[PDB]
């Protein structure tokens, strides 16, 4: 699991 | 044209690499700038992908997977297009502040790869690829590389890819079917040509990652992780391109 990439994917922004 | 409207609407803008063009070219500086550009473009690829019709219906783990495998091909294809539209394929337009002439191609130690990317760029001219064909093709590249043992929800991926192939077909379809058929053949061949280029670049960046401390090349956070965890699965044959034609 790539935590930083998943954050970008999960993030609405 | 609902689909094309969306693709044009979501298309990322200009991304700069942050490269210092006032300094003499060095291997380390050029590659460190390319790596930073990769990180910057990856951020845009995620925001773009999330907005593609049907993408969020994929399992989140498959969303992660396709982005992590497809990025090189996506980014090479887009750079080829920029190069074609901005400098008629004369140089590689990585970013407005990172344009490769032949000297930089040599200095980068990726000359052979660069020449292939420049050939790709010329193909956009030789084929008279339209902006709308470019947009659909690029979208299709996101769905063109997967694990040999399949995804978490393969059926949903398969339907999505099928629908992106359909949209490309519709953009091609020209009263004469023989012109549509030749066109689809040409474009699928061009799409296929992206993957061997991406693989060579994957090999290069992996090798460079392994020795990066020795050559003073900086790799940012996500890029360093993707290249050590995901890229080797491509290099070991666990993840493979979906080719239209046989290689
Ligand atoms: C991976 C890499 C950094 C990112 C580069 C890649 C070459 C292809 C490329 C084109 C772009 O326009 C974005 C950056 C990328 C995706 C480079 C090859 C070696 C270097 O380490």
Contact B79, B93 (CB under 8 A): yes
Which residues does B127 contact at the CB level (< 8 Å), separation at least 6? Answer: B186, B187, B190
Distance CA B53, CA B160 (A): 9
Report the Cα B245 to chain-centroid distance in Å.
19
Contact B119, B208 (CB under 8 A): no
Distance CA B237, CA B240 (A): 6
Q: Which domain holds residue B21?
A: 1-247
Distance CA B82, CA B90 (A): 11
B64–A5: do the CB atoms touch at under 8 Å? Answer: yes
> Taking CB atoms and an 8 Å cutoff, what residues of chain B touch A5?
42, 46, 64, 67-68, 222, 225-226
Exp. method: X-ray
Token pair recorded at residue B245: 């034609």
At B68, phi and psi to the nearest 5?
-75, -20
User: Going along chain B, which residue ranges are E strands?
Assistant: 92-95, 98-100, 145-147, 239-241
CA distance A2 to chain B (A): 7
List B93's β-bridge partners, or say none.
Answer: B99
Which CATH number characterizes residue B184's domain?
1.10.565.10
Distance of CA B28 from the midpoint of ligand 1 (Å): 14
Number of domains in chain B: 1
Distance CA B17, CA B34 (A): 7
- Local structure of residue B57 (DSSP, 8 states): G
Q: Is B79 exposed, middle or buried (0-12, 13-18, 19+ CB in 10 A)?
A: buried
Evaluate: CB of B209 within 6 angstroms of ligand 1. no
Contact B212, B27 (CB under 8 A): no
Rounded-to-5 percentages of helix, strand, coil across chain A: 60, 0, 40
Distance CA B165, CA B131 (A): 17
């Amino acid at each position: 699991e790539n935590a930083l990439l998943r954050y970008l994917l999960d993030k609405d922004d | 044209p609902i689909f094309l409207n969306v693709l044009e609407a979501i298309e990322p803008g200009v991304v700069c690499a942050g490269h210092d063009n006032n300094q003499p070219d060095s291997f380390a500086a050029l590659l460190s700038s390319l790596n930073e550009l990769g990180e910057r473009q990856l951020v845009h690829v995620v925001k773009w992908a999330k907005a593609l019709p049907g993408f969020r219906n994929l399992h989140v783990d498959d969303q992660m997977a396709v982005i992590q495998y497809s990025w090189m091909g996506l980014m090479v294809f887009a750079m080829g297009w920029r190069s074609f539209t901005n400098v008629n394929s004369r140089m590689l337009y990585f970013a407005p502040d990172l344009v490769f002439n032949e000297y930089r191609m040599h200095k980068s130690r990726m000359y052979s790869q660069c020449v292939r990317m420049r050939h790709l760029s010329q193909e956009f001219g030789w084929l008279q690829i339209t902006p709308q064909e470019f947009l659909c093709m690029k979208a299709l590249l996101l769905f063109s590389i997967i694990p040999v043992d399949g995804l978490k929800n393969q059926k949903f991926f398969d339907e999505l890819r099928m629908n992106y192939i359909k949209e490309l077909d519709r953009i091609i379809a020209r009263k004469n079917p023989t012109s549509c058929s030749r066109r689809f053949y040409q474009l699928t061949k061009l799409l296929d040509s992206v993957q061997p280029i991406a693989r060579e670049l994957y090999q290069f960046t992996f090798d460079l990652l392994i020795k990066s401390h020795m050559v003073s090349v900086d790799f940012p956070e996500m890029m360093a992780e993707i290249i050590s965890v995901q890229v080797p699965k491509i290099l070991s044959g666990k993840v493979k391109p979906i080719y239209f034609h046989t290689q």
